Swiss-Prot record:
Its cofactor is Mg(2+). Activated by cell stresses such as DNA damage, heat shock, osmotic shock, anisomycin and sodium arsenite, as well as pro-inflammatory stimuli such as bacterial lipopolysaccharide (LPS) and interleukin-1. Activation occurs through dual phosphorylation of Thr-177 and Tyr-179 by either of two dual specificity kinases, MAP2K3/MKK3 or MAP2K6/MKK6, and potentially also MAP2K4/MKK4, as well as by TAB1-mediated autophosphorylation. InterPro entries: Kinase-like_dom_sf, MAP_kinase, MAP_kinase_CS, MAPK14, MAPK_p38-like, Prot_kinase_dom, Protein_kinase_ATP_BS. It comes from Homo sapiens (Human). The TXY motif contains the threonine and tyrosine residues whose phosphorylation activates the MAP kinases. Serine/threonine kinase which acts as an essential component of the MAP kinase signal transduction pathway. MAPK14 is one of the four p38 MAPKs which play an important role in the cascades of cellular responses evoked by extracellular stimuli such as pro-inflammatory cytokines or physical stress leading to direct activation of transcription factors. Accordingly, p38 MAPKs phosphorylate a broad range of proteins and it has been estimated that they may have approximately 200 to 300 substrates each. (Microbial infection) Activated by phosphorylation by M.tuberculosis EsxA in T-cells leading to inhibition of IFN-gamma production; phosphorylation is apparent within 15 minutes and is inhibited by kinase-specific inhibitors SB203580 and siRNA. The modification Phosphothreonine is found at residues 13, 177, 260. Keywords: Acetylation, Apoptosis, ATP-binding, Cytoplasm, Kinase, Nucleotide-binding, Nucleus, Phosphoprotein, Serine/threonine-protein kinase, Stress response, Transcription, Transcription regulation, Transferase, Ubl conjugation. The gene is MAPK14. The modification N6-acetyllysine is found at residues 50, 149. Changing residue 165 to A: Loss of kinase activity. It is found in: Cytoplasm; Nucleus. This is Mitogen-activated protein kinase 14. It is an enzyme of class 2 (transferase). Brain, heart, placenta, pancreas and skeletal muscle. Expressed to a lesser extent in lung, liver and kidney. The lineage of its organism: Eukaryota, Metazoa, Chordata, Craniata, Vertebrata.
Length: 348
């Protein structure tokens, strides 16, 4: 009883999907693959369908595809992208080669909200709350997004938000070069590889995002890596001695000690007119030393979100076994592991 499928040209490829999904129309494209919006007759819901490109072309690729499917299957939270269905035209591992992923259909992302909006301190409170609610759940399973930006944050008409982009291929060195938004939201510790980063790298991003919604301007519009580090240390001050030790990169640590020393600026004089609580929260998020940076769970209880905070409605995730990340397998084996994940999928 595998559903009956039907083929059709779209996004320069031959989409072969189950008849339940109708009216396939393209709404995107990149290296990862092409997304199509469609109508799910079985559920009456509008949906987005992503067809993966080159799923098992290399070992690094095959492992990537497995990581995404695994992360996507684990996610069961209102503020995190959900997997409504995952399918493949294949009828046996031997033919297996395509992978499709289905999720609800969202209207726009955070950049598409600021453009046609006047974000009030309440909206900002609401959007950041949701993000921290989702991160709490993500981090509780030792899952780190690593690349929070407005482009991977989706918002429906009601201002309800979801976190997207899990297990996507790493950004090329060229893609992080110059005056690009792809680097503006990264914590310095990973922007220049100071040390082995941890989950608070995401909090730094939330700070960059929140400020952007409060001011309407990019917080750290670096024109390149160095320029960006300067804008960052100008606002938060140069590293203290405790931090300098923590930086493994002998060269990076050596470089920093070359910059004229500077003091943390006064945020109340940087974000003029902002609610002092937002200002207090921002100073807690934008701390250079990732060990002293406020965590998501800790931020949810910050007074800034009192209007939305609720201890009993901010769930944690089930354990997530990611021991596969230190496993060496062949392309065929990562593929096979993928296939078991596809066929063993249980719709919500
Ligand atoms: C109109 C379109 N709708 C929409 N709805 C839900 C998810 C997505 C989606 C998926 C998507 C689609 C199907 C399945 C899955 C997965 F299952 F993998 F999670 C994800 N991937 C992306 C981007 C994010 C940035 N990097 C490139 C991909 N968007 C916006 N799009 C839209 C376009 C732009 C902005 C907002 C909405």
């Amino acid at each position: 009883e595998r559903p009956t499928f039907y083929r059709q040209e779209l996004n320069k490829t031959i989409w072969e999907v189950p008849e339940r999904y109708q009216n396939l129309s393209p709404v995107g494209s990149g290296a990862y693959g092409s997304v199509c919006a469609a109508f799910d007759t079985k559920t009456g819901l509008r949906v987005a369908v992503k067809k993966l490109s080159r799923p098992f072309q290399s070992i690094i690729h095959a492992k990537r595809t497995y990581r995404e499917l695994r992360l996507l299957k684990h996610m069961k939270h209102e503020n995190v992208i959900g997997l409504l269905d995952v399918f493949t035209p294949a009828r046996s591992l031997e033919e297996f080669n395509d992978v499709y992923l289905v999720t609800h259909l969202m209207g726009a992302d955070l950049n598409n909200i600021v453009k046609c909006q006047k974000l009030t301190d309440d909206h900002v409170q609401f959007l950041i709350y949701q993000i921290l609610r989702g991160l709490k759940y993500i981090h509780s399973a030792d899952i780190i997004h690593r690349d929070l930006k407005p482009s991977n944050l989706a918002v429906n008409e009601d201002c309800e938000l979801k976190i997207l982009d899990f297990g996507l291929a790493r950004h090329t060195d060229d893609e992080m070069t110059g005056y690009v938004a792809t680097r503006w939201y990264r914590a310095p510790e990973i922007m220049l590889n100071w040390m082995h980063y941890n989950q608070t790298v995401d909090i730094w991003s939330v700070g960059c995002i929140m400020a952007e919604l409060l001011t309407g301007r990019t917080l750290f519009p670096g024109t390149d890596h160095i320029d960006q580090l300067k804008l960052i240390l100008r606002l938060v001050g140069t590293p203290g001695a405790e931090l300098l030790k923590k930086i493994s990169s002998e060269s990076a640590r050596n470089y920093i000690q070359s910059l004229t020393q500077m003091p943390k600026m006064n945020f109340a004089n940087v974000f003029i007119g902002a609610n002092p609580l937002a200002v207090d929260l921002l100073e807690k998020m934008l701390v250079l030393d990732s060990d002293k940076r406020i965590t998501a769970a800790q931020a949810l209880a910050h007074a800034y979100f009192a209007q939305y905070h609720d201890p009993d409605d901010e769930p944690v995730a089930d354990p997530y076994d990611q021991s596969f990340e230190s496993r060496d397998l062949l392309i065929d084996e990562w593929k096979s592991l993928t296939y078991d994940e596809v066929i063993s999928f249980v719709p919500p």
